[PDB]
Amino acid sequence: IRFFELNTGAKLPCVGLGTYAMVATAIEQAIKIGYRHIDCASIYGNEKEIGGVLKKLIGDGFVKREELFITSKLWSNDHLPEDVPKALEKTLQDLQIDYVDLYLIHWPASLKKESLMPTPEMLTKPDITSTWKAMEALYDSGKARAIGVSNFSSKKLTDLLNVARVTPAVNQVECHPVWQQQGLHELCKSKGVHLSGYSPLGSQSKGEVRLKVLQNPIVTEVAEKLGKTTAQVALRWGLQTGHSVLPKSSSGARLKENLDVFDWSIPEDLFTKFSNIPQEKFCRATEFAHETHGFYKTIEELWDGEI
């Protein structure tokens, strides 16, 4: 009851640690508190720090490698087939592990090799078939025990599924009460792809965007009625909707709080109330589209209208 089974047979722990903007001390505290699933990415710039933490905790016998589920992601400048395996090798060196449990294509949009941050002149025409074939080679050599995608629309996931030899195990997408992804859940379920919810508390976007989740009136009502925090309700909502959740916190207290989502539930009469929450996507990926210089000319193209 505390995992989702992937199409490879692997067990993905229901709650993963979000590591964007996290420092080593908080990652170590999270594992001590009980996190086993760790959501990483090369672009977060902290994989080396994370590797130091994993090396220490595994070395001390706190956890065995097999108790952890480590995800990383292929950044958009590394989409070309020659670069894919080099990117994972760097990630494995930094994380001080021999394999990741899950490796994801971070975005369906590609960038020139020389670039790191997405800018219009750096956008390139993607070739997800070729990138996926390279991902499949990493799966075949056990460097990534499962392979998947992130930020793929229903259409882009369908298009990949139509060419893939190895079915993507996971599609990691923004998902929270303000962006519920009902249609994509249906598609993923029907194809045996696990949907994993990023930014489950409403994201780290500036201007307190996350308050649209953490202080939504329905979320707040349900929290009051159940005697739980709004973060707890948002996370439990996600689990009950059938996706994993990847909450990030730099606070030990909040890390602990965010794991207390198993021993209680949201009753159906309250769960149904979430259907009336206004819907908005917070991670809009404007940086991966451009009218003149982009492959995707608009974000509506990038998301195939799922925005």
Ligand SMILES: NC(=O)c1ccc[n+]([C@@H]2O[C@H](COP(=O)([O-])OP(=O)(O)OC[C@H]3O[C@@H](n4cnc5c(N)ncnc54)[C@H](OP(=O)(O)O)[C@@H]3O)[C@@H](O)[C@H]2O)c1
């Ligand atoms: N694949 C992708 O393109 C993609 C995109 C976005 C995110 N992700 C992944 O998803 C993870 C989570 O998303 P996210 O980092 O955007 O943020 P999030 O998990 O939605 O929310 C984090 C924010 O909420 C605060 N918070 C955490 N627990 C709280 C609690 N119990 N009560 C009140 N506030 C709380 C955090 O602040 P404090 O740290 O100050 O507590 C932080 O500002 C990321 O770290 C990353 O691993 C992936």
